[PDB]
Amino acid sequence: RQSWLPGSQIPAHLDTPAAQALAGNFGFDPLGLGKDPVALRWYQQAELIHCRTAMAGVAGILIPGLLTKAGALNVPEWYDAGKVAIENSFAPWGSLLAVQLFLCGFVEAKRWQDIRKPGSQGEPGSFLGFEASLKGTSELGYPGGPFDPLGLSKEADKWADWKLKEVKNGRLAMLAFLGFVAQKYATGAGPVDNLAAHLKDPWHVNYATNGVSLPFL
Amino acid sequence: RPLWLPGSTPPAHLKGDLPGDFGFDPLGLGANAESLKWFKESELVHSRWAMAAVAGILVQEIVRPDVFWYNAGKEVESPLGPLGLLAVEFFLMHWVEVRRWQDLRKPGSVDQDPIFSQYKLPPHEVGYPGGVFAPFIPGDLAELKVKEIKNGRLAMLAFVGFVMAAQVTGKGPIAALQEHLADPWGTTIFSKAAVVPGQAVAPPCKIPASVSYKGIEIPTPCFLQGLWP
């Protein structure tokens, strides 16, 4: 099957019927972190959450960052947006961080207890009316009900394709955000400015010339 | 069956089947049949372009003198722009070449005219289409193919002789031939250059430098000038 290295041997824990059918399996565990199946279940969940919040974050970087080079949406840089936003806001940042810690803690603890038991949040009485729509959809990490409003998860023949598009765009958005961080430290300009500088002179403006990434040259 | 050396033996993959087969393959480049089809096609195409090229240089020097054929791309004039001529050549040659290559990789699959559904080219062998390409034939194909490959090999040698004689003497083929007919003992390649373990002397290149076209300064080098004498 498909692998991250054609020719390397696939590890025995990623070549099982419980692992081959997950999403985006390419036999990539050179550190052997997923040998414990409970650990692989937990790491599947951590990967899905990092994928989804990395896509949402990198979209919040790029689409305001692309449209600010167009006409509308005078938006500051992402390493400057929190300061301008807290100058425009109504609350200090500590109060807003406390509110988001309570609001995220409730939701994350719901997801926590649904990881610990799959049939957990469907207790009758536990919720006013959201208790019957807070179960899973037989595959943990992929909930239904109020999550997924448009009903696209219902169709079974598209479903592995939807999963694999999600995991590829998510891993790619994780690389995008780590590149946003490193590009921010090495250059000091925005990522669209880095893309414009690589398009203006590709053979002279890259990470071999920034003087930071490999300083032995 | 005549050979390139009379008395020796041809290589085992050269039976005598193809036209112009005289058992000449010292490197063994035709031992693969799938390679040998491609190289037969390439031999025919190089030979036909070189025959047309030698005829073009000869008629170009006879009919229009004081035009050095190595400078024909430079000193031509036309209201036709250079990029327009190059674009017409690009699209039309890409067309013709892809038709011929599709006949190569799929034998007998582009016989039918695409615009007119009436006309289909008859079945044939690769490299030798026929039909409208051959309206009139003098004699038999089994000798004319041999004549074609012989005149073509001779014209390939003639074209590389034209290129070297133009880079060394700076004159056309008829002018260099009249130079050799004036002083045969004094105008040869042995009479212009020599390498002895003391010193080496090579002829000066008569094509000067990068040639200035319309503001682009085309670099014009002389072929392997360090390895000449």
């Binding site: 050179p30 550190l31 052997g32 972190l33 414990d36 409970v38 650990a39 | -």
Partner: protein
């Protein structure tokens, strides 16, 4: 600042010690030729001395009443006053590399106990298995907490003890 310590870029005994070391190096320098090898060595020494004092004054170190850099070992006080790079980041760097070494040794022991000659692999090292475990040991904290949570990190009370336990 913290504990009555002045910053080293503000401390005067720090500059006095810098000047004193440069004075000792130039007193050793002034008894040679200009472009000779002891002169080049002492000028490189003076260059490294000036660069080291500039780097210590740059990093925001705290000097005392004698002009020497003092370190702060309290997580909250150093994270508050910007001294986290001297104990806190070094202690987590050390715990990473020390647990790396310990986890690679533990995996080598458990790998060689399952053979007919565990002691013979302890004397003569299985180099490919040691390099495989050495490369795989970069995810040692994750594997350590996973072996902790499964109960396979510990041996039970099948251990060796004395008659009064």
């Amino acid at each position: 600042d913290i504990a009555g310590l002045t910053p080293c870029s503000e401390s005067k005994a720090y500059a006095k010690l810098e000047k004193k070391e440069l004075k000792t190096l130039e007193k050793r320098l002034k008894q040679y030729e200009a472009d000779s090898a002891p002169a080049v060595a002492l000028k490189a020494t003076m260059e490294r001395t000036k660069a080291r004092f500039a780097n210590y004054a740059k990093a925001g170190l705290l000097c005392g009443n004698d002009g020497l850099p003092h370190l702060i070992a309290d997580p909250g006080l150093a994270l508050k006053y910007g001294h986290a790079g001297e104990v806190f980041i070094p202690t987590f760097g050390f715990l990473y590399v020390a647990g790396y070494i310990g986890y690679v040794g533990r995996q080598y022991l458990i790998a060689v106990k399952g053979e007919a000659k565990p002691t013979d692999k302890e004397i003569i090292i299985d180099v490919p298995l040691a390099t495989k475990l050495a490369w795989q040991g970069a995810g040692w904290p994750l594997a350590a907490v996973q072996e902790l949570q499964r109960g396979t990190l510990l041996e039970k009370e099948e251990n060796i003890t004395v008659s009064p336990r």
